[PDB]
Coordinates of C-alpha atoms and ligand atoms in Angstrom, one line a residue:
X636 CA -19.1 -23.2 -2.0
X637 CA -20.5 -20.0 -0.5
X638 CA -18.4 -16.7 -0.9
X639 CA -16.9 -13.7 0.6
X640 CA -15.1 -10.9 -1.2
X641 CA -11.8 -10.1 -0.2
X642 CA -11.4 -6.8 1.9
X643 CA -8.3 -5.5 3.2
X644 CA -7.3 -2.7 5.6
X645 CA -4.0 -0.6 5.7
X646 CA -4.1 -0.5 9.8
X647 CA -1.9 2.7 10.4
X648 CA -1.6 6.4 9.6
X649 CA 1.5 8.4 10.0
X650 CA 0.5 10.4 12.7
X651 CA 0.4 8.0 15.4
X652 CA 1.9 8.6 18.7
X653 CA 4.9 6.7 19.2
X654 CA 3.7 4.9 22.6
X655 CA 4.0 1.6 21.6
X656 CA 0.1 0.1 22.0
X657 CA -0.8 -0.4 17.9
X658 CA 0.3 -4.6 18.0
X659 CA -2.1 -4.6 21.2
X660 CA -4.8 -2.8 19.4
X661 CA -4.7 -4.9 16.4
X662 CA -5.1 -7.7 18.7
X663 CA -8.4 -5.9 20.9
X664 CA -9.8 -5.3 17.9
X665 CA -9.7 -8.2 15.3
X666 CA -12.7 -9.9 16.2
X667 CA -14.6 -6.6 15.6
X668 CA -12.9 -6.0 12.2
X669 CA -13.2 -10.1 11.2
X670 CA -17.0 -9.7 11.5
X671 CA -17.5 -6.3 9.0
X672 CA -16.0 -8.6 6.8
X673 CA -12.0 -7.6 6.8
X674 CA -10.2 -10.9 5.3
X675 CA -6.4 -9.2 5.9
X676 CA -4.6 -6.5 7.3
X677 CA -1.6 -4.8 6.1
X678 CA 0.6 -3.9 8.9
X679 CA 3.5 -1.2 9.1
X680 CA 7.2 -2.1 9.2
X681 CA 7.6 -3.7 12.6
X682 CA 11.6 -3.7 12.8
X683 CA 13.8 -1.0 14.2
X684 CA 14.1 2.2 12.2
X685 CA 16.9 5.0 12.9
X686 CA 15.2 5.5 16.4
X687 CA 12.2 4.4 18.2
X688 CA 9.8 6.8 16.6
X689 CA 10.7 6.4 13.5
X690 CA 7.6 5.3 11.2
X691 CA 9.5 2.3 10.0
X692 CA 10.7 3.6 6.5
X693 CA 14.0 4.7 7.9
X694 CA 15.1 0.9 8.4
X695 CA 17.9 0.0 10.5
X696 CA 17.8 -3.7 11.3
X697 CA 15.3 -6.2 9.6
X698 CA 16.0 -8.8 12.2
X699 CA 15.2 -6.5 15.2
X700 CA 11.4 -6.7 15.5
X701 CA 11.3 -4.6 18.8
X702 CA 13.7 -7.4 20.4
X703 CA 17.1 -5.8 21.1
X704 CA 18.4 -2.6 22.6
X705 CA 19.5 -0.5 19.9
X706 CA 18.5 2.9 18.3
X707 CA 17.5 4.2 21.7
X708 CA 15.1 1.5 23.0
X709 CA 13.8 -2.0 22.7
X710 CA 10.4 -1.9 21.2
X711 CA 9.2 0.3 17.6
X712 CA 7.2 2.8 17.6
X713 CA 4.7 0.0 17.7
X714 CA 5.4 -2.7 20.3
X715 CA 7.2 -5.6 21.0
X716 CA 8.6 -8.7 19.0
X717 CA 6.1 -10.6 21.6
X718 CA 3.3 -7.9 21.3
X719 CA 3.7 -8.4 17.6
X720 CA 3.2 -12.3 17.5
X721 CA 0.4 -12.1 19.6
X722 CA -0.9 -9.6 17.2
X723 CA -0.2 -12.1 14.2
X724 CA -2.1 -15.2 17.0
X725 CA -5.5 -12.9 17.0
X726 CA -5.5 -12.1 13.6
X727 CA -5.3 -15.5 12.5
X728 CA -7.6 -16.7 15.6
X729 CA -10.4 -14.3 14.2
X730 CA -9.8 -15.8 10.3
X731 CA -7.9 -12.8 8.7
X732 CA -4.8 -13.0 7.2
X733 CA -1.8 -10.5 7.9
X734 CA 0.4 -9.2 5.2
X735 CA 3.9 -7.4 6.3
X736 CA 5.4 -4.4 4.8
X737 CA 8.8 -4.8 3.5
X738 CA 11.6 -2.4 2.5
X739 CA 14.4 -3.1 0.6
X740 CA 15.3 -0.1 -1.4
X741 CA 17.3 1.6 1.5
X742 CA 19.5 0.9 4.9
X743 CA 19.6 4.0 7.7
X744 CA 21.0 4.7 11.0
X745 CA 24.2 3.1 10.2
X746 CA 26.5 3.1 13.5
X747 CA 29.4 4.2 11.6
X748 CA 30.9 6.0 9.0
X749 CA 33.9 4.2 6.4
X750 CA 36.0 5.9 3.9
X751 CA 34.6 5.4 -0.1
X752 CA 35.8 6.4 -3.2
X753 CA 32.9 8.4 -4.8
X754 CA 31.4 10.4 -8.1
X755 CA 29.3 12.9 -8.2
X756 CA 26.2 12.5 -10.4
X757 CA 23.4 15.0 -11.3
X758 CA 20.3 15.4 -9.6
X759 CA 18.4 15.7 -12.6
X760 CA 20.4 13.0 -14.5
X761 CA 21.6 10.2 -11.9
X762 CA 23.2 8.8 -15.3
X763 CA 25.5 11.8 -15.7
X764 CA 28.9 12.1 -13.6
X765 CA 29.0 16.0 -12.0
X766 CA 32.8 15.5 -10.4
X767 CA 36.3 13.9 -10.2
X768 CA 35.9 10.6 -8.3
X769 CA 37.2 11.7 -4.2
X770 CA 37.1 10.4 -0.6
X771 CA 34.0 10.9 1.3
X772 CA 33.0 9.7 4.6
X773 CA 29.6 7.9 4.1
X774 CA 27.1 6.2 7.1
X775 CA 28.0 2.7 5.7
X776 CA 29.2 0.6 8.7
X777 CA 26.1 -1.7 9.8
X778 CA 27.1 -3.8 13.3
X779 CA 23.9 -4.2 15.0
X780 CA 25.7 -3.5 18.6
X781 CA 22.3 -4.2 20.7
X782 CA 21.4 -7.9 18.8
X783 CA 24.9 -9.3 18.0
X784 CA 25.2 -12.6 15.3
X785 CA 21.6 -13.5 16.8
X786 CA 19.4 -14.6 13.8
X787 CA 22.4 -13.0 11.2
X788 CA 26.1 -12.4 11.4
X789 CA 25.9 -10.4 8.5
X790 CA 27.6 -7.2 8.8
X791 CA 26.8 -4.2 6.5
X792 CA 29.3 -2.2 4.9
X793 CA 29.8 0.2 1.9
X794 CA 30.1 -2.1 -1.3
X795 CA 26.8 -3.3 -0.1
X796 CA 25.7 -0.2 -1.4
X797 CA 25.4 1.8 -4.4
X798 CA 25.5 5.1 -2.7
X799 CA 24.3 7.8 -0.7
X800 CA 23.7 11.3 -0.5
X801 CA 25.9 13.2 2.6
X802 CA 29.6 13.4 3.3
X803 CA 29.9 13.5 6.7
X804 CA 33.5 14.8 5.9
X805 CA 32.8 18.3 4.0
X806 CA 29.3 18.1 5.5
X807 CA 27.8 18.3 2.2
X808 CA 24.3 16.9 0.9
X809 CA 25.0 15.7 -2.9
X810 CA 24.0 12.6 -4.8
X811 CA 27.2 10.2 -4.5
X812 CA 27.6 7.0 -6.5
X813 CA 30.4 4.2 -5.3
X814 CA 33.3 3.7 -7.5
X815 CA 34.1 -0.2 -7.6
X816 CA 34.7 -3.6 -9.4
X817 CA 31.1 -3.7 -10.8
X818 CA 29.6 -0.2 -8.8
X819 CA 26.9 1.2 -11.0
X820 CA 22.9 2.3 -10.7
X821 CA 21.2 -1.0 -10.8
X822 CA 18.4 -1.3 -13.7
X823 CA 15.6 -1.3 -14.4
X824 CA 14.2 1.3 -12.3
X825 CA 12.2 4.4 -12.8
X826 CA 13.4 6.4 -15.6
X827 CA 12.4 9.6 -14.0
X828 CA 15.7 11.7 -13.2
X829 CA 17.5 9.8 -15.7
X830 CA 18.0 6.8 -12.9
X831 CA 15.4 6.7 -10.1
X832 CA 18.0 4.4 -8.1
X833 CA 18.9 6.6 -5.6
X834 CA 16.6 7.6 -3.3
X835 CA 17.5 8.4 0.1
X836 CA 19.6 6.7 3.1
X837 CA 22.3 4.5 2.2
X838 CA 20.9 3.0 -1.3
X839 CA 21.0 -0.5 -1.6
X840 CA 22.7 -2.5 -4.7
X841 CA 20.4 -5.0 -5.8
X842 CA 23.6 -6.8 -7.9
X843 CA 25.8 -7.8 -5.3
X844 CA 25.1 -11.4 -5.0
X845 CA 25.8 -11.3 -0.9
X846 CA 23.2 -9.0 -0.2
X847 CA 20.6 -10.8 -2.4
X848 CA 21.2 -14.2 -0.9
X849 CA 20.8 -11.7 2.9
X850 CA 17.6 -10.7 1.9
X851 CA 16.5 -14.4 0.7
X852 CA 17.4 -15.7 4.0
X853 CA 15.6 -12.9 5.5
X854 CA 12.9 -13.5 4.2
X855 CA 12.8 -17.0 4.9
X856 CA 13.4 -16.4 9.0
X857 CA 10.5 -13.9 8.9
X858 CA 8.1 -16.1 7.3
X859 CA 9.0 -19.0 9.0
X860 CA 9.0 -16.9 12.9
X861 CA 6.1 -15.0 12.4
X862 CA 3.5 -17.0 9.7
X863 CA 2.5 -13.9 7.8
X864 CA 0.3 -14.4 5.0
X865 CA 1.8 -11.8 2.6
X866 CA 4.2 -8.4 1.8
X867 CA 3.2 -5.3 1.3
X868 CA 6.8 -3.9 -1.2
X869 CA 7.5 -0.6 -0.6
X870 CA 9.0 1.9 -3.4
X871 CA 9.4 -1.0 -5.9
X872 CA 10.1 1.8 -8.5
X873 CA 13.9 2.7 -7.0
X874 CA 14.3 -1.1 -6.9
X875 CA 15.5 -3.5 -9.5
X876 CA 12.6 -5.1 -11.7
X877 CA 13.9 -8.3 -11.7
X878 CA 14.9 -8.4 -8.0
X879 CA 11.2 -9.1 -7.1
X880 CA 10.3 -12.1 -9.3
X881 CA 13.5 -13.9 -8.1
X882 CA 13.1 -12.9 -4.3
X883 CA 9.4 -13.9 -4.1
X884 CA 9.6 -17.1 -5.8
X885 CA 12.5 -18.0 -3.1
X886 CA 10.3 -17.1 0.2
X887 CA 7.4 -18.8 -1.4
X888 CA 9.2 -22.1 -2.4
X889 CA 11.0 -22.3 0.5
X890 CA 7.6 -21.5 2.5
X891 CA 5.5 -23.3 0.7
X892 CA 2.9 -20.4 1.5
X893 CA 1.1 -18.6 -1.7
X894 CA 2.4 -15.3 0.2
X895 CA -0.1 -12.8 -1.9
X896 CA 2.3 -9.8 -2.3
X897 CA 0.9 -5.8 -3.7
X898 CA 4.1 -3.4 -4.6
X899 CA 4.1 0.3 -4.6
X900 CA 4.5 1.5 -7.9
X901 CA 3.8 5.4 -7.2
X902 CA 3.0 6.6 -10.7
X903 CA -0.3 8.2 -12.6
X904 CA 1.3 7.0 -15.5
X905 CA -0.6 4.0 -16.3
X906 CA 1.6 2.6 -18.9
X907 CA 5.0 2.7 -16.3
X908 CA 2.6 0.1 -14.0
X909 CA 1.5 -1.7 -17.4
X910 CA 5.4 -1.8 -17.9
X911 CA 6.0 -3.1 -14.4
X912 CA 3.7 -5.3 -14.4
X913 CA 4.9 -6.8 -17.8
X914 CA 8.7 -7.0 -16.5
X915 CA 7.6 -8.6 -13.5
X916 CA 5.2 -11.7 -14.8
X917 CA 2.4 -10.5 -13.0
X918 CA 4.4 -11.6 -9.7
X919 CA 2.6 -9.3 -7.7
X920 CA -0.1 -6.7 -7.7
X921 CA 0.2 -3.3 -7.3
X922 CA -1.7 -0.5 -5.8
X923 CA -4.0 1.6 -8.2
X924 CA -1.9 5.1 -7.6
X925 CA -4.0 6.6 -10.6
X926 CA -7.6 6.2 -9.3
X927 CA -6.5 8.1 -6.2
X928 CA -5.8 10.5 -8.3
X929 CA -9.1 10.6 -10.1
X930 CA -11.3 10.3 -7.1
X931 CA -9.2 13.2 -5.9
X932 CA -9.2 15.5 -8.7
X933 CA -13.3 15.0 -8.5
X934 CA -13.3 16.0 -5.3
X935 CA -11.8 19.1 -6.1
X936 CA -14.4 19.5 -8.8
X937 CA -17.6 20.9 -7.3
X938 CA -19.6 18.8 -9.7
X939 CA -17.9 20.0 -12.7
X940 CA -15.7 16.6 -13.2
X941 CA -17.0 14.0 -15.6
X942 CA -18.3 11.0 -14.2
X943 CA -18.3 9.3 -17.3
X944 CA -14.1 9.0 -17.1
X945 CA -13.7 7.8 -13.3
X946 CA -12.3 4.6 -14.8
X947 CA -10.7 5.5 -17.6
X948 CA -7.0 4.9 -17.7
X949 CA -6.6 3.0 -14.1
X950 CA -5.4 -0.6 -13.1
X951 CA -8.8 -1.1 -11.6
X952 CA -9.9 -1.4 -15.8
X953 CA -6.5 -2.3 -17.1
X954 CA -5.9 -5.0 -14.7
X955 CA -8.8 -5.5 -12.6
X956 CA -7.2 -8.5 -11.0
X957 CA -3.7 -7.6 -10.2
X958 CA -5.1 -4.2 -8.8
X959 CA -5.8 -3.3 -5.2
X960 CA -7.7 0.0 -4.8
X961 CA -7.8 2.6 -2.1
X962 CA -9.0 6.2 -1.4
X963 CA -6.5 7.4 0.7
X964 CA -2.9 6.2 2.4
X965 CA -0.7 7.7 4.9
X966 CA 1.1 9.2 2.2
X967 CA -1.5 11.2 0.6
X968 CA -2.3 12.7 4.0
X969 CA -2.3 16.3 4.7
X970 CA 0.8 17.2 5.3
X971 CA 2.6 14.3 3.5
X972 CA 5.0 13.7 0.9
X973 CA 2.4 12.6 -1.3
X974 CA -0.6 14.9 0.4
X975 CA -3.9 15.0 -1.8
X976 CA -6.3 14.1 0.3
X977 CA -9.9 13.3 -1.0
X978 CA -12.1 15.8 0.0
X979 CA -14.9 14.3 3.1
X980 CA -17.4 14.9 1.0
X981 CA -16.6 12.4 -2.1
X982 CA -15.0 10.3 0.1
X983 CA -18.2 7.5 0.7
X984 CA -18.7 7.6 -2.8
X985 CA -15.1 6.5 -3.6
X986 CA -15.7 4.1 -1.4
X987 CA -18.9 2.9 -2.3
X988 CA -16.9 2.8 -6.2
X989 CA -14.1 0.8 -4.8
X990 CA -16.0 -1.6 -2.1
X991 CA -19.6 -3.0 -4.3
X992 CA -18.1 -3.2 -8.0
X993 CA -16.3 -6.7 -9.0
X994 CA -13.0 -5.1 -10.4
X995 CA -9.8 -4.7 -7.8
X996 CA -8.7 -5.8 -4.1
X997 CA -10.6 -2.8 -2.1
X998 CA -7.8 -1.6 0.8
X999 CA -9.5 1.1 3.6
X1000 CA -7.4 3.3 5.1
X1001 CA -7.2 3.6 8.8
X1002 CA -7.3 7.0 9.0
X1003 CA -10.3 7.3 7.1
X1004 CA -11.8 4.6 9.7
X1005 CA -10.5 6.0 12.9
X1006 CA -9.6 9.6 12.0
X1007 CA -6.7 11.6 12.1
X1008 CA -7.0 13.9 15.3
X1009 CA -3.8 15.7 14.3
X1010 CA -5.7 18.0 11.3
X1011 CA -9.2 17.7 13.3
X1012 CA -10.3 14.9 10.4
X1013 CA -13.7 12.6 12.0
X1014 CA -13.8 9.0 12.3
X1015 CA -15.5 7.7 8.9
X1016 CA -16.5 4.4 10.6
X1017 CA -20.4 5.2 10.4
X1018 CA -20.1 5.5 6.6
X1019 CA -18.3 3.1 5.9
X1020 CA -19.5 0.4 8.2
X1021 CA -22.8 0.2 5.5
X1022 CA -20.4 -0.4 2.9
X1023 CA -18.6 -3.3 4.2
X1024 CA -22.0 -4.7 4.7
X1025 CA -22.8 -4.2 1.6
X1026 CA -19.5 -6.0 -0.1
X1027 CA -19.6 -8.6 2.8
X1028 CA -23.2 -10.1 2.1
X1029 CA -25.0 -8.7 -1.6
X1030 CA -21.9 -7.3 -3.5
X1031 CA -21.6 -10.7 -5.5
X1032 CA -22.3 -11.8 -9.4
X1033 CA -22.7 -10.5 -12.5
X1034 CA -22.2 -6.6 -12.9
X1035 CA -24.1 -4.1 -14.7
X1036 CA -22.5 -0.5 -15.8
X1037 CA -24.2 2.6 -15.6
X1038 CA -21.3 5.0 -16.8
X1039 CA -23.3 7.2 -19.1
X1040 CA -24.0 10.3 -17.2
X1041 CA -20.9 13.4 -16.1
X1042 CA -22.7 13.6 -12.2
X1043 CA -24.6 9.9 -11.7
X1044 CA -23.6 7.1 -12.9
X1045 CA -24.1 3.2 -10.9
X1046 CA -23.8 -0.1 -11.8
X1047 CA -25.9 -3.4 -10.2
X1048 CA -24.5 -6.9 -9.2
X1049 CA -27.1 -9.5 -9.9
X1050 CA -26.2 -11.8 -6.6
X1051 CA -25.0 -15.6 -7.0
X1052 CA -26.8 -18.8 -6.1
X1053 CA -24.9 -20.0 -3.6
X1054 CA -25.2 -16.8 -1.4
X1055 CA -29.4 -16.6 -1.0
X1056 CA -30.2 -12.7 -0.7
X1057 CA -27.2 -11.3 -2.7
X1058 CA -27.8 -8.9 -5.1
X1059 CA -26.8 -5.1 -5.4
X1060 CA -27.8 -2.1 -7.0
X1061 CA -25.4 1.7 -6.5
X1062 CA -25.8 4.8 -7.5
X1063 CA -22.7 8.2 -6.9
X1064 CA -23.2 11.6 -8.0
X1065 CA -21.0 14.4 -7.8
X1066 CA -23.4 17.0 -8.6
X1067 CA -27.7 17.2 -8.1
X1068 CA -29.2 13.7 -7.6
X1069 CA -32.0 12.1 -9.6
X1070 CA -32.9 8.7 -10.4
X1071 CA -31.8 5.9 -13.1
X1072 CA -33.2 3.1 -14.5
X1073 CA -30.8 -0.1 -13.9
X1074 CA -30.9 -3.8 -14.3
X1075 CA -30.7 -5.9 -11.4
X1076 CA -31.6 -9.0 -12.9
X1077 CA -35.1 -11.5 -14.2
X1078 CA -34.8 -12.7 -10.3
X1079 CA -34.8 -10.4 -8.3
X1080 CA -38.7 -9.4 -10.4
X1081 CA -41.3 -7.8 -7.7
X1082 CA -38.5 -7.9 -4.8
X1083 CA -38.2 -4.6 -3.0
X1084 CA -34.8 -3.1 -2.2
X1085 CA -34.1 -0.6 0.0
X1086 CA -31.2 1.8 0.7
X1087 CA -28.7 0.1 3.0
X1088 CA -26.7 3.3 3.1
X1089 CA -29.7 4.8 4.9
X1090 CA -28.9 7.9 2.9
X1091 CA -32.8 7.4 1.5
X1092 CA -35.9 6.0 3.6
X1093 CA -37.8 5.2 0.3
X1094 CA -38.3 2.2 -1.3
X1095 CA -38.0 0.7 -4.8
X1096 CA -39.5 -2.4 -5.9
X1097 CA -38.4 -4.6 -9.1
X1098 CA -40.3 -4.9 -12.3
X1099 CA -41.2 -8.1 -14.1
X1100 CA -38.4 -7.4 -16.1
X1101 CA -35.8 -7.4 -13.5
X1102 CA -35.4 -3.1 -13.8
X1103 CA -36.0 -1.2 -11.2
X1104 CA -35.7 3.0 -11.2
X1105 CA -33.1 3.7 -8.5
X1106 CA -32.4 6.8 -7.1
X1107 CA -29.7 9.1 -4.7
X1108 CA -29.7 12.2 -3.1
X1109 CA -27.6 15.2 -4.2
X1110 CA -23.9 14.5 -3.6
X1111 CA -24.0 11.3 -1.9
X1112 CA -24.2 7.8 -2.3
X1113 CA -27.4 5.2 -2.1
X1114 CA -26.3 1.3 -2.1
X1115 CA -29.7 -0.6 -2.7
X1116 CA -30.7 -4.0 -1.6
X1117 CA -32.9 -6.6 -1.5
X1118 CA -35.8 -6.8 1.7
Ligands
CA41 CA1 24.3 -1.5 -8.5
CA42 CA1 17.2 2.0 -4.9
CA43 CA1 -20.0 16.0 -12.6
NA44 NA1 20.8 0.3 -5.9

């Protein structure tokens, strides 16, 4: 049939203002995204959090999708349960899919605090026992005063738990495990700190059978109300490997949707997401934390980085197809827990990288699209707007590398058959520009390509040969194709 790359869009930043309009923005502006060529969107976590402006990583009640009165208000920081299906209703009306972000590692906001037997463990070494076992008063008790037993009557309570990190008590900020019948750090996790379990909040214990089968029925109800298309897993690392495999084959079965899911594994180390990946059965796919990392380190560069090793070492070559690439997220932003920020400068060329070649799910940022007004950063849209073009209509067929140079280096896409007037030909440099001598293929012989980018008003026209001696400007980006 005829073809069209997939292209997906994280559609927040953490900055927002917590007035409630994104769900109605979403759905005044799907049509407009549909038609750049946008196939999903990955929306942020749209139950309440520990209060209304809450980002929605400080989850309180899953079942609460800006529907009940608790936490200080009705809606999220976002909208409405009914400003959120209509959101879902113009997404789908304008042919993109809509994928939800879950989190699972950790429960917050409790309404009340409960008596536990704890231990002390080191910081350093969650696996090492720092103290005596004592009493604490921990933020355990989960009643949902404002919803009631609508949806769930599942109450939350301390052995749902494996601990947490305050004793409201002594009022002292410690890492405490739960003592118990079966109470322990669940594995695997992240080795990192002996036990990456723990992370903040009240941490949840992946082995207690009750709150597994609560999370499977969850999951169930949310599909089945709002008809999302897919999950977008937060900090998979500090959750149990195994938990995944056996959670998503549940929702999908039970669905009977395909429910494409892409975890965050945050990690440079490319062998703990080879690992993952491995102990998951290529479940899910995961988002390429490493190549952030390159194209920000040759940002930082002034020309000096190596071209030559922009691929080297990330899912995007490991694992091109269980990898979903992005520049920057809204925790890499300035600021941020993650901050490291691509400078402006390299940013169209990382995106050029990401958007024309075959390997990896491309994800844009929102930030990068709309801007961030709180550091003074400039709406991107007029860069990146050529780019989408160019993925959406020529970036399609067989691919041609052009790694062999520290400042430019390209690669071509030769088009495919069944889409007339595909056909590709890109070029990124970090340092000086200059030209290179590609192949775009036998067919494309005498055509003339131009530089959709509009970076460049010359021409190049295509030998009998199928080579043609493309060129770019000094630091930037030139994305040729065909008259
Ligand atoms: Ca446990
Ligand atoms: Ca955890
Ligand atoms: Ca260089
Ligand atoms: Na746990």
């Amino acid at each position: 049939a005829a073809p069209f790359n997939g292209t997906m869009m994280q559609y927040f930043e953490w900055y927002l203002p917590d007035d409630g309009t994104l769900w109605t923005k979403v759905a005044n502006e799907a049509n407009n995204l549909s038609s750049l060529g946008i196939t999903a969107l990955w929306l942020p976590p749209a139950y309440k959090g520990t209060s209304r402006s809450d980002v929605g990583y400080g989850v309180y009640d899953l079942y609460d999708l800006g529907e009940f009165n608790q936490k200080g208000a009705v809606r999220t920081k976002y909208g409405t349960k009914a400003q959120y299906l209509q959101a879902i209703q113009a997404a789908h009306a304008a042919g993109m899919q809509v994928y939800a972000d879950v989190v699972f590692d950790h429960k917050g906001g409790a309404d009340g605090t409960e008596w536990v037997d704890a231990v002390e463990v080191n910081p350093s070494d969650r696996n090492q026992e720092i103290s005596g076992t004592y009493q604490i008063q921990a933020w355990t008790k989960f009643d949902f005063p404002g919803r009631g037993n609508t949806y769930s009557s599942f109450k939350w309570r301390w052995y749902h738990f494996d601990g947490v990190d305050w004793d409201e008590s002594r009022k002292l900020s410690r890492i405490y495990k739960f003592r118990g019948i079966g109470k322990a750090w669940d594995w695997e996790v992240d080795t990192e700190n002996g036990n990456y379990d723990y992370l903040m909040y009240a941490d949840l214990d992946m082995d207690h059978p009750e709150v597994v089968t609560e999370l499977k029925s969850w999951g169930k109800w949310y599909v089945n109300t709002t008809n999302i298309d897919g999950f977008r897993l937060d900090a998979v690392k500090h959750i149990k490997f195994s938990f995944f495999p056996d959670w998503l084959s549940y929702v999908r079965s039970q669905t009977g949707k395909p429910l494409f899911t892409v975890g965050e594994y945050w990690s440079y180390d490319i062998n703990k997401l080879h690992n993952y990946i491995m102990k998951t059965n290529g479940t899910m796919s995961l988002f390429d934390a490493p190549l952030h990392n390159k194209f920000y380190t040759a940002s930082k560069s002034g020309g000096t980085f190596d071209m030559r090793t922009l691929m080297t070492n990330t899912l995007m070559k490991d694992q091109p197809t269980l990898a979903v690439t992005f520049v920057d997220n809204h925790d890499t932003e300035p600021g941020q827990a993650l901050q490291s920020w691509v400078d402006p400068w390299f940013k169209p060329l990382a995106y050029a990288f990401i958007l024309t070649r075959q390997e990896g799910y491309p994800c844009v940022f929102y930030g990068d699209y709309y801007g961030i007004p709180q550091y003074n950063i400039p709406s991107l849209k007029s860069k990146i707007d050529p780019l989408l073009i160019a993925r959406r209509d020529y970036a399609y067929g067989t691919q041609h590398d052009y790694l062999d140079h520290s400042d430019i280096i390209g690669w071509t896409r030769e088009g495919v058959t069944e889409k007339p007037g595909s056909g590709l030909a890109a070029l990124i440099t970090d340092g000086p520009g200059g030209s290179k001598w590609m192949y775009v293929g036998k067919q494309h012989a005498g055509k003339v390509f131009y530089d959709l980018t509009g970076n460049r008003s010359d021409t190049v026209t295509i030998n009998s040969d199928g080579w043609g001696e493309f060129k770019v400007n000094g630091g930037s980006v030139s994305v040729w194709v065909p008259r």
